[PDB]
């Protein structure tokens, strides 16, 4: 049938990478992964996660007593202070996790966008955008031509006189 | 026949930390944490009383070292380490609650 890109849905057949390609020509179909955009997305998330596994050096000692209870007026100032600080660290934990979930989702959504305008400026006038995340190449691009878009070695002037006859005239 | 667009750069920039990366080269940076101070009690526009050899609670009872501070008036009271409250030996009861009263008292 037909193939669609990242605008419609995500592929469940991509297992060796986060972002990848999928071509369709006369030789058949094909699916590859993008190692440079997957590694760039993971390097920002474990760097984000390296910020959270660093432990404090401030040692807190014991001021209450679980066996022999402290005096009641000093036992209520300690209890009121500890619940005040607990509200702060429960707010800051729930705020930080919810904020870094917005940043994680948005950074992986901008790596797929950055891969999209990289291919779009490679295929300068030889391809048109479908609207679902795919490019309609207007020349006979075989299996090593499709490899040239994948590894950033495409030359648009090799097919420029051929793909322009198929766009404005045919 | 072409026209480009670019941003400026320097040879060596400053390394700051970001949310997902440590040591990003930015062009310029500044310090947010203060470490240098002025090693004096700069108090223009205030009414400063410097006790010195006298203690804060002594001015209530009046030992010989607190003779000129028995009716003092201040916007800023500076306590020194060598200040003593008593001449005959003894001490106050709830002395730290009384010190927080006269520090806030204005005279």
């Amino acid at each position: 049938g037909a193939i669609a890109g990242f605008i419609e849905n995500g592929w469940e057949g991509l297992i060796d990478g986060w972002y990848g390609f999928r071509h369709q020509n006369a030789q058949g179909e094909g699916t590859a992964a993008d190692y440079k955009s997957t590694q760039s997305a993971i390097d920002q998330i474990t760097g984000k996660l390296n910020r959270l596994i660093e432990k404090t050096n401030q040692q807190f000692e014991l001021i209450d007593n679980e066996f022999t209870e402290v005096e009641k007026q000093i036992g209520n100032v300690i209890n009121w202070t500890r619940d005040s600080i607990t509200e702060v660290w429960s707010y800051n934990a729930e705020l930080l996790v919810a904020m870094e979930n917005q940043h994680t989702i948005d950074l992986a959504d901008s790596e797929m966008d950055k891969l999209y305008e990289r291919v779009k400026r490679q295929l300068r006038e030889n391809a048109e955008e479908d609207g679902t995340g795919c490019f309609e190449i207007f020349h006979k691009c075989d299996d090593d031509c499709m490899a040239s878009i994948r590894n950033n070695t495409y030359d648009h002037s090799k097919y420029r006189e051929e793909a322009m006859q198929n766009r404005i005239q045919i | 026949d072409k026209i480009c667009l670019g941003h400026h750069a320097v040879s060596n920039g400053t390394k700051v930390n970001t949310l997902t990366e440590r040591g990003v080269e930015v062009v310029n940076a500044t310090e947010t944490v203060e470490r240098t101070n002025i090693p004096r009690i700069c108090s223009k526009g205030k009414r400063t009383v410097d006790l010195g050899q006298c203690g804060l609670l002594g001015t209530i009872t009046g030992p010989p070292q607190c003779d000129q501070f028995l009716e003092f008036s201040a916007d800023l009271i500076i306590e020194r380490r060598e200040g003593s409250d008593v001449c005959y030996p003894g001490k106050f009861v709830n002395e730290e609650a009384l010190r927080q009263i006269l520090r806030e008292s204005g005279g």
Partner: antibody, heavy 125, light 114 residues
Framework: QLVQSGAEVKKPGASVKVSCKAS????????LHWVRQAPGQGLEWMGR????????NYAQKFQGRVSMTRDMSISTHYMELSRLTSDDTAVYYC????????????????????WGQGTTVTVSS | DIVMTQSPLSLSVTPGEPASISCRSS???????????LDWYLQKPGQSPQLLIY???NRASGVPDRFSGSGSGTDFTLKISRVEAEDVGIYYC???????????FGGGTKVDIK
């Protein structure tokens, strides 16, 4: 694959500079590590450099007297260790990540996979 | 300050009987992404070190199926299903959890044919 420079004999107080030419790397955004192995003793991690930016992370033992640079046009890394002593007599390895591996778990690996042949450095009189 | 402690510090083996090298950590080596940052190395006499296991349990490229890795948290074991004559040398464990502390190696474990 990595290829280092030859052996060097130095005197206490001088500075040694080792080369490491990463030949065949199309990513150049991994981490390259320099480690150290004295004769008889075990391996000893010195530092780590990013070929994209140049951000280094030395050990606390080798802090101050290690400078690591690179020249990405010729794809060559350097390591300079100043104020040498007799206990700097060792073999100096440069190592990095292999690349072109089709596992998902290999993206979370930041250590040493492919290694250099070693550089013997002798400091005596 | 993560300190790696290896054991049994020497291991005379027989070519056909399994072996096991353990390396226990001081702090937990388990990252937030769910991986244990422990690497197993083999250095033969005169050669560069060879990577065997790279994230606690995952075998490298040119490593046979004799070498296995298990363990999580602080306690880790390298496991050889059967020993050949090409499996002698010194085995180091190496942690890579946090880089501003740094990467550190184990003490080593000499393995010779008995």
């Amino acid at each position: 694959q990595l290829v280092q420079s030859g052996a060097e004999v130095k005197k206490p107080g001088a500075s040694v500079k080792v080369s490491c030419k990463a030949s065949g790397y199309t990513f150049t955004g991994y981490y390259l590590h320099w480690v150290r192995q004295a004769p008889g003793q075990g391996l000893e991690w010195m530092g780590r450099i990013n070929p994209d930016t140049g951000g280094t992370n030395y050990a606390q033992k080798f802090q101050g007297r290690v400078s690591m640079t690179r020249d990405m046009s010729i794809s060559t890394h350097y390591m300079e260790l100043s104020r040498l002593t007799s206990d700097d007599t060792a073999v100096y390895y440069c190592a990095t990540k292999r690349g072109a591996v089709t596992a998902m778990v290999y993206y979370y690996f930041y250590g040493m996979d492919v290694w250099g042949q070693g550089t013997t450095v002798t400091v005596s009189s | 300050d993560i300190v790696m402690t290896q054991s049994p510090l020497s291991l005379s083996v027989t070519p056909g009987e399994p072996a096991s090298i353990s390396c226990r950590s001081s702090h937990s080596l388990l990252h937030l992404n769910g991986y244990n940052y422990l690497d197993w190395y083999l250095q033969k006499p005169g050669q560069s070190p060879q990577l065997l296991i790279y994230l606690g349990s995952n075998r490298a490229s040119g490593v046979p199926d004799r070498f296995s890795g298990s363990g999580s948290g602080t306690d880790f074991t390298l496991k050889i299903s059967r020993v050949e004559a090409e499996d002698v040398g010194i085995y180091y464990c190496m942690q890579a959890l946090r880089t501003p502390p740094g990467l550190t190696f184990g003490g080593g474990t000499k393995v010779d044919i008995k």
